[PDB]
Amino acid sequence: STGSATTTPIDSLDDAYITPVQIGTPAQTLNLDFDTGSSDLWVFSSETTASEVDGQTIYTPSKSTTAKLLSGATWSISYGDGSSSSGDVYTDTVSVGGLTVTGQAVESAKKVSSSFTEDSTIDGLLGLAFSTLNTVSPTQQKTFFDNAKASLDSPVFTADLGYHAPGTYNFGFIDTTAYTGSITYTAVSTKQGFWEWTSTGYAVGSGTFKSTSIDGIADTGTTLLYLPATVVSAYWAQVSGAKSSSSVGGYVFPCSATLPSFTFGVGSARIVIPGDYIDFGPISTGSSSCFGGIQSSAGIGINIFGDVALKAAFVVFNGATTPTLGFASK
């Protein structure tokens, strides 16, 4: 089997992407944030504290003939950005782009933090990291991909995120029309539960490539590119007037600037992030200070190849017995 679904930016900045997911019988379609940095499929629901729902579409398990309470199971998750959610668990039928999993754990939120409430466009998350990170207790549950894997034509999924435009998540096949040149594959460590890999270096604009190992994660659920402070300083030094602002929370730059590209290495291959991908717009409405899309990972504890990086590539998440990651230009 295979699946193919379009993923759509939630706003004009590509802060996140939503993908429609069918849950239950008859189908209830919710727009979920596919997150290769976490491993829980959770949804706003009829159980979510009413004051914490503001415009989201909810899953109502009592209206699904295939929903079953997973007795005694609870979940609770905290994300890198400080947001969180928790609740109980149902199993139900879940379909993405025509690919169906029966008995998928659907984690129903009883509580969500303010950032979730305040974002009316995201109805929940669909985790695509390794199932070892799943938070369900006392019996850990499998991700949608882990459950689908054996049925897929090939044990892979691909992320093809758009810049200010829709893109695609495919399951079970590699669309050879969706990228240019070849796909370069690189080793993955699953030791921390992430799609963790080592970039071979970087360049700023038309500058020379610096060969240096940068360990980080491929994370579709993180907006920006978070890299070591040395790398990030070298980038922003090429933008007149750019500075790190503790009050704003990172590097800002004059909105009048033209940003240089940023290149990262994948083995001997190179992925180029155009400068415009690094512009996250005014820090507040009407400001002439703009927020940068490359930020320091210092104090995160890990480097993160988030959407800024991934949307410059066609990315293969290869879930073979020994997982790997592939990157192609597009």
Curated annotation (Swiss-Prot):
Could you tell me the Gene Ontology terms of the biological process aspect for this record?
proteolysis
Q: Which reaction does it catalyse?
A: Hydrolysis of proteins with specificity similar to that of pepsin A, prefers hydrophobic residues at P1 and P1', but does not cleave 14-Ala-|-Leu-15 in the B chain of insulin or Z-Glu-Tyr. Clots milk
Q: Where would I find the Peptidase A1 domain in this sequence? A: 17-328
Q: Which domain of life is it from?
A: Eukaryota
- Coiled coil, from the record: none
Keywords, sorted A to Z: Aspartyl protease, Disulfide bond, Hydrolase, Protease, Signal, Zymogen
Disulfide connectivity for this sequence is: C255-C290
Q: Name one GO molecular function term.
A: aspartic-type endopeptidase activity
Q: What is its EC number?
A: 3.4.23.22
List the catalytic residues: D35, S199
Q: Which family does it belong to?
A: Belongs to the peptidase A1 family.
Can you name this protein? Endothiapepsin
Q: Which organism is it from?
A: Cryphonectria parasitica (Chestnut blight fungus)
